[PDB]
Amino acid sequence: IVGGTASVRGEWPWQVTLHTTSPTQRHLCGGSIIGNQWILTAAHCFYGVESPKILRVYSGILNQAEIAEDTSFFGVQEIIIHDQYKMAESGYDIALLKLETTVNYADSQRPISLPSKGDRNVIYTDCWVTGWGYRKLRDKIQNTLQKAKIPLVTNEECQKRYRGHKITHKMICAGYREGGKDACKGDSGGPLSCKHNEVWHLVGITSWGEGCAQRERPGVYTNVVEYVDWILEKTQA
Numbered sequence: 395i396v397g398g399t400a401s402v403r404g405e406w407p408w409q410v411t412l413h414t415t416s417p418t419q420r421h422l423c424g425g426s427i428i429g430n431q432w433i434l435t436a437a438h439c440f441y442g443v444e445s446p447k448i449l450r451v452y453s454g455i456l457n458q459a460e461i462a463e464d465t466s467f468f469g470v471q472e473i474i475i476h477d478q479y480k481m482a483e484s485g486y487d488i489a490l491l492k493l494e495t496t497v498n499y500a501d502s503q504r505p506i507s508l509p510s511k512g513d514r515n516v517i518y519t520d521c522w523v524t525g526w527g528y529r530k531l532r533d534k535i536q537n538t539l540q541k542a543k544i545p546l547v548t549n550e551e552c553q554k555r556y557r558g559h560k561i562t563h564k565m566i567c568a569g570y571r572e573g574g575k576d577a578c579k580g581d582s583g584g585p586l587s588c589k590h591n592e593v594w595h596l597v598g599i600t601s602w603g604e605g606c607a608q609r610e611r612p613g614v615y616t617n618v619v620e621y622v623d624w625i626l627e628k629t630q631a
């Protein structure tokens with residue numbers, strides 16, 4: 395995350411850090427707990443990933459330093475990628491990770507509610523993007539989970555900033571006209587939480603953008619509310 399600040403421990407209990415053991419263990423992407431056995435993340439985060447066996451999900455983490463060889467984690471039983479996904483910039487950048495075991499909720503790890511179709515009209519004014527991603531290009535994974543408050547921008551305005559792409563209604567953008575605060579490499583799959591009426595909603599999933607925090611280049615996110623039916627279908631045993 396760029397132009398962000400250190401998060402408070404337990405402040406984003408649905409935020410998880412997704413790790414890969416190949417070749418050696420490291421943070422791969424962010425993700426969000428949406429069910430006792432489900433993580434919602436980005437699809438493009440599984441490029442080159444041929445087996446869920448090399449994945450490790452860590453919940454209730456503030457600092458990457460807390461993660462050691464002993465540290466407990468959640469295995470991944472199945473990776474579910476939207477069948478229409480091709481690449482982040484084309485949309486459908488969403489995936490579900492079915493965990494091998496169930497998450498026991500607590501103050502440090504709990505699920506975030508999904509947006510309601512009737513909320514597609516709601517005006518989110520308190521939105522935050524979080525992650526251990528780059529604080530700048532050519533940077534590196536950060537130790538402490540970062541947070542940044544960023545305003546949502548209309549799809550019309552976003553389309554103007556990406557004339558080379560098609561910003562669909564299945565995407566949602568966020569950023570400052572002057573740039574300065576945004577998600578970056580490593581934040582992918584992360585949640586774009588928006589508190590409405592005392593309740594936090596998973597409005598978006600960190601997906602892509604041109605560079606990071608550049609002026610007139612809003613971050614682009616998967617518009618989660620457009621996938622509630624998909625999520626229900628894929629999670630209902």
Ligand SMILES: *[C@](=O)([C]([C][C][C][N]C([N])=[N])[N]C(=O)[C]N1C(=O)C([N][C]C2=[C][C]=[C][C]=[C]2)=[C]N=C1S[C])C1=N[C]=[C]S1
Pocket residue numbers: 438439482483527576577578579580581582583600601602603604605606607612613614
């Ligand atoms: C993800 O953490 C990053 C997050 C990027 C967020 N960017 C913001 N908010 N400024 N996602 C990606 O790397 C996805 N991605 C891209 O963002 C780009 N950008 C180049 C581009 C896009 C549009 C127009 C011009 C240029 C290119 N490819 C990809 S696919 C990986 C990470 N995911 C994996 C590692 S870090």
